[PDB]
Swiss-Prot record:
It comes from the Eukaryota. Coiled coil: none annotated. One of its GO terms (cellular component) is plasma membrane. A motif (SH3-binding) lies at residues 60-66. Pfam families: SH3BGR (PF04908). This is Adapter SH3BGRL. It is found in: Cytoplasm, Cytosol; Cell membrane. Belongs to the SH3BGR family. Appears to function as an adapter protein that bridges proteins together or proteins with mRNAs. May function as a ubiquitin ligase-substrate adapter. Additionally, associates with translating cytoplasmic ribosomes and may promote the expression of specific mRNAs. GO terms for molecular function: protein-RNA adaptor activity; SH3 domain binding; ubiquitin-like ligase-substrate adaptor activity. One of its GO terms (biological process) is proteasome-mediated ubiquitin-dependent protein catabolic process. Residues 53-70 are annotated as: Required for interaction with PFN1, HER2, and ATG12. Monomer. Interacts with PFN1/Profilin-1. Interacts with ERBB2. Interacts with ATG12. Interacts with BECN1. Interacts with translating ribosomes. It comes from Homo sapiens.
Amino acid sequence: VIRVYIASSSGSTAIKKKQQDVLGFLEANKIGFEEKDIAANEENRKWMRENVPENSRPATGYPLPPQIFNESQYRGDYDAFFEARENNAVYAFLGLTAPPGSKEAEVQAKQQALEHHHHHH
């Protein structure tokens, strides 16, 4: 399942909206997910902060929610999610197989078919 770490009592309206954006997208696309609130749960808060890789931790304070993981594996922050959706490559971003019928899956299918034909003699 995709774990989305959020802060329900974030001091920023922008953060609240970014979290709802991610949660709503997962729901809409029927992607199995669960929210992990760090606002009032020390385990969730500490876990998120430690499991966000160094290269995704801002130079100021702590990494900001939402932070997205596939089970315990880090996938990315809101910016990474935002870009993945702009490129219609959200499933790859989440470390999930793009569903048969989805544009992402078709695009992936065509790309692999081409790379195979080039490899093929």
